[PDB]
Amino acid sequence: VEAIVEFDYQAQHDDELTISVGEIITNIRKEDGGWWEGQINGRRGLFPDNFVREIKK
Amino acid sequence: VEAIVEFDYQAQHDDELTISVGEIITNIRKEDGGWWEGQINGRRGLFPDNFVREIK
């Protein structure tokens, strides 16, 4: 599962992933609650799902 | 189109709707971006859609 960042978001906890508009997020593990875990080149972490769009195929 | 509040939200703007868990939001009109316009009581305003569940 991959996704691309639609809105910027700054981590607020050491377990969160700071994402920026455009980046592709990989190794994405879903889960209800509004937060997903995945990696963007650098770090891995929990990022807010409503700020990114899931890629197809 | 109605929904029920899942998380609490304190409207941080004159045009925002303050919502509380359990409340029924109605006359909701959607719009991309993370904010919906709906109504509770006699109050209407904008609130984050991921903060409520749309009733089936």
Partner: peptide
């Protein structure tokens, strides 16, 4: 131009 979206609370 919608305002910035809000993340769902960490619960």
């Amino acid at each position: 131009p919608a305002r910035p979206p809000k993340p769902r609370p960490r619960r």
